[PDB]
Design a protein around this ligand. Structure first.
Ligand SMILES: *[C@@H]1O[C@H](CO)[C@@H](O[C@@H]2O[C@H](CO)[C@@H](O[C@@H]3O[C@H](CO[C@H]4O[C@H](CO)[C@@H](O)[C@H](O)[C@@H]4O)[C@@H](O)[C@H](O[C@H]4O[C@H](CO)[C@@H](O)[C@H](O)[C@@H]4O)[C@@H]3O)[C@H](O)[C@H]2NC(C)=O)[C@H](O)[C@H]1NC(C)=O
Ligand SMILES: *[C@@H]1O[C@H](CO)[C@@H](O[C@@H]2O[C@H](CO)[C@@H](O)[C@H](O)[C@H]2NC(C)=O)[C@H](O)[C@H]1NC(C)=O
Ligand SMILES: *[C@@H]1O[C@H](CO)[C@@H](O[C@@H]2O[C@H](CO)[C@@H](O)[C@H](O)[C@H]2NC(C)=O)[C@H](O)[C@H]1NC(C)=O
Ligand SMILES: *[C@@H]1O[C@H](CO)[C@@H](O[C@@H]2O[C@H](CO)[C@@H](O)[C@H](O)[C@H]2NC(C)=O)[C@H](O)[C@H]1NC(C)=O
Ligand SMILES: *[C@@H]1O[C@H](CO)[C@@H](O[C@@H]2O[C@H](CO)[C@@H](O)[C@H](O)[C@H]2NC(C)=O)[C@H](O)[C@H]1NC(C)=O
Ligand SMILES: *[C@@H]1O[C@H](CO)[C@@H](O[C@@H]2O[C@H](CO)[C@@H](O)[C@H](O)[C@H]2NC(C)=O)[C@H](O)[C@H]1NC(C)=O
Ligand SMILES: *[C@@H]1O[C@H](CO)[C@@H](O[C@@H]2O[C@H](CO)[C@@H](O)[C@H](O)[C@H]2NC(C)=O)[C@H](O)[C@H]1NC(C)=O
Ligand code: NAG
Ligand code: NAG
Ligand code: NAG
Ligand code: NAG
Ligand code: NAG
Ligand code: NAG
Ligand code: NAG
Ligand code: NAG
Ligand code: NAG
Ligand code: NAG
Ligand code: NAG
Ligand code: NAG
Ligand code: NAG
Ligand code: NAG
Ligand code: NAG
Ligand code: NAG
Ligand code: NAG
Ligand code: NAG
Ligand code: NAG
Ligand code: NAG
Ligand code: NAG
Lengths: 123, 107, 422, 92, 128, 72, 46, 42
């Protein structure tokens, strides 16, 4: 079920992405408060979708990119991260770099688009 | 409570002179020292409210000024009608207090 | 729809959204844009939102309906100078108390401008038209800088051309999220505490030869004006109903003298000559420019109206607009004060301005004028400029003239050499 | 905090359409209820009478009612007012 | 404005005196009424003041217990009663109006203007 | 920054399309007016996205199609 | 007219929510951005 | 003396609520995240 994988390792938890995704959309004073809440849920949803589109990821729960991982963001093994750590721990571990990484993801996609402006294969 | 006192007891001056008297407040009274004129047989009247500014009907010959504790009343030109005992009062605090008055004679 | 932001004040309460420190703007190199301050809808929105703030602010305040009773009034003749003779009325009436079966006799002072004779018996001037609400004494309407900000999907373009007169192409433009702060001072004939022109006096109009249009003059120097209500007024209060207090002037201390405003005479003359020079550019440097006072109408139109310390002043500007221009001391403007105000050129919805304790003094900056031309024809080529009446919108148009709101439209197409790959 | 705020709101809205008792804030004439009172209740109830409004504006009616002393305050058979008359209107 | 005092009399030590001050020309409930005593010689002293709108009183320490004050808002008049007299109380008693201050939802605000509209003064003597 | 490319040529301007996209999704009467403004921002955003969907350009900032350019 | 305005906002927000709900499913099923999508689920005779 | 005195209190209604809501917390879900892998876009 929803958040059932919260205590699972990142590897195991990556297999439940769909259930989490499905739970994002589901008296004058009271009526305004409720409209406020509904509009915001929509706006947040759309912002995440826009970022994925900007980064070149669309319609995917798992998307690969061309940005190298920096040892300065986190110096850990693949087995360490994927098998002995949860997503909550990871999120805290690298919260300092969220904006740096996002900036790089955008730059990478922009270069990709520039490369696609060539009709020459660029080999 | 705030003690109020005056200095020039039994002051005397000639008609046409300039006459001043002073009043001192304990603590400080936010520049709210009022002055009154009391003649024998009459209810006292108000001359100056605050430390400066006249009560309507009071002649322009009267004026005053001061610091937080040191206040002065002035009569620019003494008239025969100014013989009275003058009083000063703190309208600043609740237990309103009057100081001793100072009598003015004609020389 | 724009929203406002700012850094017991109505303005601060409403424009609750914070502003950025060091807001940035983006210069748009090589962009020419067309502006028109007379068709600007930021002005219309600002006007509408201001009206709303006043109506909302007074919404929960004490209603004064119970005071619309017959008054018995006499003239105050006690220590009144000639300048003020007949201005104050000393009135009494039988008012209610918090208990419905009891009354009290109330005595108070009123300005004659608020009271009219019935057929002596008097009534408050608003009784035959509408109810009146007492403004809450703890609610401040003192203007503070307000920044108008665009919603996502929109942008505000700012015109930086130094001589821009509000209409036509602008070549130095930039994009901003919020306007500079605008202080919403409400006044009539003279504009107070606005921005100044940087290079010269700038005269802006919609149609300069059209006598039906006003002229907005922005000065490049301020003129200081010192206003006062010289007597010591004492505020008293009574209870009208459960939880409802009414404020009135009890007593005025000292000989009564008129309210007035001073401007340096030399400064006023110098900044008038500057205006004349700019007017000559449109009307000819061989014509005669004359200034004259207002033509007549309601007090709210014919005088210079402003809020000083919370009090409402109506000053006579005939002492300013009295000169002919052909190719130390202060000017004193007498003023009148009133408490029953029909604000924003509306009928009814009156407000009562509570009295203010003590002596009132304020100092303001004159930053511009609203002028009108007196009709005319070629005649003897002498034209007269009179202080205009004007809409309140004109006071906002004079600050928002450099801003435009546009919508962003992200899709477009163009030809290239590519084809769908497969 | 939300539970608190929403509760305050329900009370304020629920009383919104109810009868106002402003017409009731009148001087009352009151005596003690002394009929079969135990010692513990002496002085707790008062028998008040007053001129209340009615359906027509030109008519009045005399009303007798009982009040607890906590709701009624003496002005200075003695005269009394409701405790709230000096603070706010009181909605039924 | 006019304030009128009455009640001059001769009292024996040990009894009480009640003085009155009728007022007119102003809203009765809007101004606090002060009582001031002028002893023979000596100096003026404040005894206390009643707020005519709600009955709040405030007394000089010398007279706490000894002095009580009341108000009549139907008949616009103020009263002062000195509960137990001694020969030391021979004096002229004056009624005076504070000419400033007002009440509000937040409590009373005093602005500081002085005493005006003084009454005539009522002589009370205490001796046999 | 946002719209800094407004005076740039089309070629150069097209180099920075992301900056123009990421800036699109950022008292009873006041509250209603603000909700209406938020809703329109969303409705306009979605309308444009739907067209890209219909034209087969979903997810792209630059999309090549088969419609020929008309000299007229 | 407060009530009319709220009802209209109700209706507009809801229309958006329904639109997005269907788009999310196409995303989840791997059919994003298409009007016609082939899948790997066999059709059941039942 | 080490004797402590306790008395009835309250009156602030929020403290009554707190006795039922003490076990609940509200959080926001944040669906995006990144992590290193051996995958590269092609
Ligand atoms: C054009 O622009 C000028 C300059 O900004 C405006 O002038 C100001 O006007 C405001 C409102 O009238 C004045 O605010 C008042 O200040 C009083 C204190 O004054 C002393 O301290 C200041 C400290 O900054 C000194 O500058 C000043 O010289 C004095 O020494 C306060 O006591 C006032 O309080 C009132 O409101 C509060 C509300 O909570 C009540 O509790 C108080 O009892 C009282 O009623 C008030 O805050 C301001 O001082 C003026 N500035 C100057 C330099 O004079 C013009 O008003 C504006 N023109 C127009 C038309 O709007
Ligand atoms: C009005 O009343 C005030 C007092 O409330 C007077 O203020 C005094 O004025 C003098 C002269 O400058 C100052 O030295 C005092 O400090 C002021 N009093 C206070 C409270 O500081 C004022 O002069 C009166 N004005 C008129 C014209 O009546
Ligand atoms: C009224 O005009 C004066 C100038 O005549 C303004 O005061 C100056 O403001 C500038 C702002 O850049 C400062 O650098 C100067 O030092 C100020 N001069 C003095 C003498 O202080 C004043 O701010 C204007 N008032 C209003 C309300 O706009
Ligand atoms: C406006 O100017 C007048 C003078 O034209 C000022 O009045 C004078 O004030 C001085 C004190 O500074 C007195 O000695 C003079 O007797 C007054 N003159 C007259 C004719 O009464 C007045 O105070 C100024 N007002 C303002 C707001 O600045
Ligand atoms: C308005 O009032 C200000 C004071 O608040 C006046 O400015 C002062 O003028 C004197 C000369 O009379 C100078 O010595 C002071 O240095 C000035 N003070 C400040 C702060 O500038 C000003 O002149 C008055 N304006 C008008 C038109 O009357
Ligand atoms: C409150 O006062 C009323 C008025 O005196 C009482 O009602 C009267 O009771 C007597 C019997 O004792 C009857 O004969 C009268 O006809 C009644 N009069 C009216 C107008 O109703 C009432 O009983 C008192 N209530 C209490 C609790 O003491
Ligand atoms: C306002 O009007 C009232 C009367 O309605 C005046 O009150 C009178 O004042 C004189 C002394 O000034 C007394 O002798 C009278 O007995 C008072 N009459 C009443 C009915 O109280 C009051 O003085 C007037 N105030 C002003 C400034 O003119
Ligand atoms: C909790 O840790 C144990 C370790 O033996 C593991 O078997 C279990 O699956 C973990 N729980 C979750 C939700 O992953
Ligand atoms: C990222 O890698 C670069 C080298 O390519 C290094 O200089 C930099 O310090 C690293 N981390 C951060 C947070 O910049
Ligand atoms: C960066 O990491 C340190 C701990 O090493 C932390 O204290 C700081 O708040 C973090 N900064 C941000 C922006 O997360
Ligand atoms: C009050 O002023 C008016 C001004 O028109 C005058 O006609 C009237 O006689 C004056 N009344 C008194 C009592 O002075
Ligand atoms: C107030 O009521 C009395 C009767 O109680 C009446 O004689 C007087 O004229 C009324 N005064 C006013 C100002 O209405
Ligand atoms: C109210 O009375 C004034 C004064 O007589 C008059 O000028 C005005 O037209 C009247 N208003 C109405 C609505 O009749
Ligand atoms: C635009 O700004 C530059 C300074 O950056 C200035 O030299 C130029 O004259 C300005 N253009 C106009 C039309 O004012
Ligand atoms: C000034 O106004 C005229 C119209 O009266 C307009 O044609 C011109 O573009 C405006 N701007 C400047 C800088 O002259
Ligand atoms: C205003 O413009 C005139 C133009 O003649 C100039 O002489 C004056 O110095 C300018 N004033 C300021 C403050 O720029
Ligand atoms: C300017 O005003 C004149 C009236 O004198 C009018 O004939 C002319 O058409 C107006 N200009 C414009 C652009 O409307
Ligand atoms: C006066 O008007 C003429 C046009 O007739 C113009 O050429 C000249 O520059 C203007 N100004 C002066 C100072 O002559
Ligand atoms: C304008 O001035 C004249 C005197 O020259 C005066 O009669 C007229 O009433 C004034 N206008 C206004 C609106 O006061
Ligand atoms: C303005 O002052 C003039 C001085 O001659 C006077 O005649 C006129 O009536 C006054 N106007 C106003 C509205 O006060
Ligand atoms: C206008 O100026 C003349 C002197 O040229 C003077 O006599 C007249 O009174 C002035 N008008 C006003 C309203 O002050
Ligand atoms: C303004 O002052 C100058 C002197 O510098 C004087 O010649 C001129 O006549 C004055 N202005 C008016 C309208 O009189
Ligand atoms: C009501 O009870 C009080 C108890 O203190 C008593 O003083 C009062 O006289 C009683 N009143 C009547 C009408 O019995
Ligand atoms: C009711 O009103 C009449 C006057 O009409 C009065 O005599 C009587 O005392 C009042 N009764 C009560 C209980 O208030
Ligand atoms: C109302 O009357 C009660 C009587 O007990 C008193 O305690 C309270 O302070 C009064 N409130 C006001 C606003 O006068
Ligand atoms: C404006 O034109 C110049 C022409 O040399 C060009 O170098 C500059 O980049 C252009 N500005 C923009 C924003 O493209
Ligand atoms: C498009 O091309 C066709 C020929 O294929 C031509 O007939 C038509 O006029 C052109 N333009 C438009 C707007 O249809
Ligand atoms: C789908 O087919 C299987 C056999 O392959 C069958 O057991 C199952 O019941 C069918 N689905 C449904 C809904 O009947």
């Amino acid at each position: 079920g929803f958040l059932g994988a919260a205590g699972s390792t990142m590897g195991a938890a990556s297999m439940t992405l769909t259930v989490q995704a499905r739970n994002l959309l589901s008296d004058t004073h009271w009526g305004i408060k409720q409209l406020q809440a509904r509009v915001l849920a929509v706006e947040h949803y759309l912002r995440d979708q826009q970022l994925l589109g900007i980064w070149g990821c669309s319609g995917k729960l798992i998307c690969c990119t061309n940005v190298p991982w920096n040892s300065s963001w986190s110096n850990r093994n693949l087995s360490e991260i994927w098998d002995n750590m949860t997503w909550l721990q990871w999120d805290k571990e690298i919260s300092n770099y969220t904006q740096i990484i996002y900036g790089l993801l955008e730059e990478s996609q922009n270069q990709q688009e520039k490369n696609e402006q060539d009709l020459l294969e660029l080999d | 409570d705030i003690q109020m006192t005056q200095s020039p007891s039994s002051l005397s001056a000639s008609i046409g002179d300039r006459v001043t008297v002073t009043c001192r407040a304990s603590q400080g009274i936010n520049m709210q020292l009022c002055w009154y004129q009391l003649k024998p047989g009459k209810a006292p009247t108000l001359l100056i409210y605050g430390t400066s500014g006249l009560q309507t009907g009071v002649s322009s010959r009267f004026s005053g000024s001061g610091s937080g504790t040191n206040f002065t009343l002035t009569i620019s030109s003494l008239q025969p009608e100014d013989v009275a005992t003058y009083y000063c009062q703190q309208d600043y605090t609740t237990p309103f207090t009057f100081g001793p008055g100072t009598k003015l004679d004609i020389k | 729809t724009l929203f406002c932001a700012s850094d017991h004040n109505v303005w601060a309460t409403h424009c609750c959204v914070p502003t950025d420190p060091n807001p940035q703007e983006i210069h748009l190199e090589n962009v020419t844009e067309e502006f028109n301050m007379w068709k600007n809808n930021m002005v219309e929105q600002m006007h509408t939102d201001i009206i709303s703030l006043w109506d909302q602010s007074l919404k929960p305040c004490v209603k004064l309906t119970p005071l619309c009773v017959t008054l018995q009034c006499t003239n105050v003749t006690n220590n009144i100078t000639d300048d003020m003779r007949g201005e104050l009325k000393n009135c009494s009436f039988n008012m209610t108390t918090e208990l419905r079966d009891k009354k009290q006799k109330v005595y108070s002072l009123f300005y004659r401008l608020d009271v009219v004779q019935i057929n002596k018996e008097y009534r408050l001037i608003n009784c035959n038209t509408s109810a009146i609400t007492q403004a809450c004494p703890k609610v401040s309407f003192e203007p503070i800088p307000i920044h108008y900000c665009a919603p996502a999907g929109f942008a505000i373009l700012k015109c930086k051309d130094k001589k821009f007169n509000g209409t036509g192409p602008c070549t130095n433009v930039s994009t901003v999220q919020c306007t500079h702060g605008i202080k919403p001072v409400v006044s009539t004939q003279l504009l107070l505490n606005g921005s100044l022109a940087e290079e010269e006096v700038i005269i802006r109009s919609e149609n300069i030869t059209n006598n039906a249009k006003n002229i907005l003059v922005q000065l490049n120097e301020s003129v200081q004006i010192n206003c006062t209500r010289p007597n010591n007024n004492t505020v008293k209060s009574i209870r009208i109903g459960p939880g409802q207090w009414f404020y009135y002037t009890g007593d005025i201390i000292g000989d009564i003298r008129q309210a007035h405003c001073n401007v340096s005479k030399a400064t006023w003359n110098e900044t008038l000559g500057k205006v004349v020079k700019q007017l000559r550019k449109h009307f000819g440097n061989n014509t005669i420019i004359r200034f004259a006072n207002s033509s007549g109408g309601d007090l709210e139109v014919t005088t210079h109206s402003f809020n000083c310390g919370g009090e409402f002043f109506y000053c006579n500007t005939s002492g300013l607009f009295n000169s002919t221009w052909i190719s130390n001391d202060s000017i004193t403007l007498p003023c009148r004060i009133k408490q029953i105000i029909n604000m924003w050129q509306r009928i009814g919805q009156a407000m009562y301005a509570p009295p203010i304790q003590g002596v009132i003094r304020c100092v303001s900056n004159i930053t511009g004028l609203i002028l009108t031309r007196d009709g005319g024809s070629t005649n003897s080529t002498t034209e007269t400029f009179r202080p205009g009446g004007g809409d309140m919108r004109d006071n906002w148009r004079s600050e928002l003239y450099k801003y435009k709101v546009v919508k962003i439209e992200p899709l477009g197409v163009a030809p290239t050499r590519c084809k769908r790959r497969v | 905090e939300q539970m608190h705020t929403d509760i305050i709101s329900l009370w304020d809205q629920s009383l919104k359409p109810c009868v106002k008792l402003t017409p009731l804030c009148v001087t009352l004439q009151c005596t003690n209820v002394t009929n079969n009172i135990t010692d513990d209740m002496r002085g707790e109830l008062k028998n008040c009478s007053f001129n209340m409004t009615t359906e027509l504006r030109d008519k009045k009616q005399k009303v007798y009612s009982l009040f607890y002393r906590l709701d009624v305050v003496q002005i200075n058979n003695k005269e009394y007012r409701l405790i709230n008359c000096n603070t706010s209107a009181i909605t039924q | 404005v006019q304030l009128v005092q009455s009640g001059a009399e001769v009292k024996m030590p040990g009894t009480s005196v009640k003085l009155s001050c009728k007022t007119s020309g102003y809203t009765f409930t809007s101004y606090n009424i002060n009582w001031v005593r002028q002893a023979p010689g000596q100096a003026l002293e404040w005894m206390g003041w009643i707020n005519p709108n709600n009955g709040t009183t405030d007394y000089a320490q010398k007279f706490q217990g000894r002095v009580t004050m009341t108000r009549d808002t139907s008949t616009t008049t103020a009263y002062m009663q000195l509960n137990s007299l001694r020969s030391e109380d021979t004096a002229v008693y004056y009624c005076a109006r504070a000419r400033g201050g007002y009440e509000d939802d937040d409590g009373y605000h005093y602005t500081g203007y002085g005493l005006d509209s003084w009454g005539q003064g009522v002589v009370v003597t205490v001796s046999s």
